[PDB]
Amino acid sequence: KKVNGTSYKKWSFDLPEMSNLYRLSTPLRDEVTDKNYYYLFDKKSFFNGKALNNAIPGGPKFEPLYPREEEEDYNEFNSIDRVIFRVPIRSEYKVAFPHLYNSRPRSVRIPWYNNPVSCIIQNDEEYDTPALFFDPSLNPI
Amino acid sequence: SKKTHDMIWEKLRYILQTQELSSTLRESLETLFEIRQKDYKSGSQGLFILDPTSYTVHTHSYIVSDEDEANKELGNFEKCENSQLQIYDMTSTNDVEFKKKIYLVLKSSLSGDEAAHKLLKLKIANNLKKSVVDIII
C-alpha cells in the first residue's frame, strides 16, 4: 500500500507521514513560496536581460545577442533638445515592460505580469495554537 | 504571561467588532490593535539602569484583591528611644604611513576628477582632513 512493489516505481503516502517528512526536511526546503518574490527574477526576465544586454542586479551577464551596435543613423528624432528628462529609465523598467521601454527589442518574450498579493498566515513557534485563530497582524474589523 | 495576555486580547477584541460604543473612544480602542501589528516599538524605551543580575530580583507577588494594611502611621512623627604600559611614540610612523597613502593616490591618477574620487572613497575621518589638504599642497 505504500509503494507498488520491489521494482520501486511508484509510491503513495498518508497525511501524518507526509507531515513528518515535511517537518524533517525544513533546513533544505526552507524557501520563499509566493510567486511575487520572483518579480523580475524568474526565467523570462533573465531571458529578456540576455536578449537586451541589460543587467538586473543579482542576475547573470552574458555576451551580447546582437553585438553590432556601431551602425547608427544621424537623425533628429531622439535629439536631446526635444527630450524631457523627468524620470531616469533605470534598467529594471526595460525588463518589466520590454516593448515599451526599449527601442528595437528582438528575441524578447512577454513576461508574466502580476500575482495576487498573498495573505497566507502561518506560525512556526507554538504548535498548540488552533488552526482557526485571529492573527495579531490582522485588522480588527 | 503570553497565554493569559492573549486571552485578554481575545476578550477585548470581542467588543470592537460586535458591540456599539462611543465615537471618540473607538479610535483609541483600535489604536491598541494597531500597535500589535507594529509590535510595540514605541512603548519600550526607558531607564534599565540595573543589570538583570545587579537588580536582586524581588518580584513581589501582590494582587489588588488583598489587603495592604495602609501603614500611613510612619509618615507622621514618632519618638524613637532607639596595568597599561604608556609608551610615548616619538617615531610618528603613523603620520608617515598616511602621507604615503595620499601621495600615491595622487600619483596614480590621470585626472583630478579621478583623483578626488579616490580620496572621497577612502572616507577619511573629520580630524584628519586638515592633514590631507596639507599633503596635497
Partner: peptide, 27 residues
C-alpha cells in the same frame, strides 16, 4: 542596475569591466 553605462562585455577588453559611480560628480 546597468543604466546604459558599461562595456558590452569584458571579453575583448583586457579589463574586468567593473564600473563605479563617481563621487566627484556633483550630480
Amino acid at each position: 542596475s546597468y543604466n546604459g553605462i558599461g562595456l558590452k562585455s569584458a571579453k575583448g577588453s583586457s579589463t574586468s569591466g567593473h564600473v563605479q559611480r563617481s563621487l566627484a560628480s556633483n550630480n
